[PDB]
């Protein structure tokens, strides 16, 4: 029933090819797109905060440890990876991720 | 040796791709943001057509942009995308990413 939407923080599975886990991710693409492709553009949350300039910090009140890697945005199949909503990022977090990623992509 | 730059069309792995991030990022990180190229044009909403006689054929799948390690995939330059193709890919991807 769930379709991820922009600003959602979701659990996403990953599975090794040869004999993995689950990691949070911030969704950037809107549900309208996500629901007609089964894909989404999302940025991973990592536990390693190093001060790297594309890190975007998450407020403690959201409950999600780690930082978003804005430059690691990737198209992922959220059905196959069993996306599960954890939280919703505030507008200013989403704006910082999009601003840093848009800069890297050469958006005008 | 070679460091991909923005607008380059590259071989990766075996398959072509369009690089969006610039060499100043790509060289230092070993990563790049790029969109894959496919010969299976279907006319679906995020395809961007490559002009003929460019050196590589097909469509850029703007919605499949991703960060990837280009050194391990042994990136190799194929061509340079025309400015209008690069601008169309960025327009479609920017809309998809919620960037207006």
């Amino acid at each position: 029933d769930y379709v991820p939407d922009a600003g959602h923080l979701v659990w996403l599975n990953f599975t090794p090819q040869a004999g993995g886990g689950r990691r949070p991710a911030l969704v950037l693409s809107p549900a309208a797109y996500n629901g007609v492709t089964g894909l989404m553009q999302a940025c991973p949350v990592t536990s390693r905060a190093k001060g790297y300039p594309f890190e975007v910090t998450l407020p403690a009140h959201l409950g999600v440890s780690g930082v978003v890697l804005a430059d690691h945005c990737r198209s992922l199949d959220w059905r196959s990876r069993r996306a599960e909503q954890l939280a919703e990022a505030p507008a200013d977090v989403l704006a910082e991720v999009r601003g840093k990623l848009g800069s890297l992509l050469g958006m005008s | 040796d070679y460091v991909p730059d923005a607008g380059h069309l590259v071989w990766l792995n075996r398959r072509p791709a369009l690089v969006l991030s610039p060499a100043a990022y790509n060289g230092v990180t070993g990563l790049m943001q790029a969109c894959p190229v496919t010969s299976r044009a279907k006319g679906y909403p995020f395809e961007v057509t490559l002009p003929a006689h460019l050196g590589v054929s097909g469509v850029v799948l703007a919605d499949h942009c991703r960060s990837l390690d280009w050194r391990s995939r042994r990136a190799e330059q194929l061509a340079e995308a025309p400015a209008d193709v690069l601008a169309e890919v960025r327009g479609k991807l920017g809309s998809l990413l919620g960037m207006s």
Partner: peptide, 30 residues
């Protein structure tokens, strides 16, 4: 966000490697 200002803050110690999402899933092209 000015890209040059961002890139000026990168260092060998704060670089992150490629994020591992495992094997290709579903409708992913790559």
């Amino acid at each position: 966000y000015d890209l040059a200002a961002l890139l000026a803050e990168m260092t060998p110690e704060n670089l992150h490697g490629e994020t591992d999402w495992g094997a290709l899933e579903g409708r992913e092209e790559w």
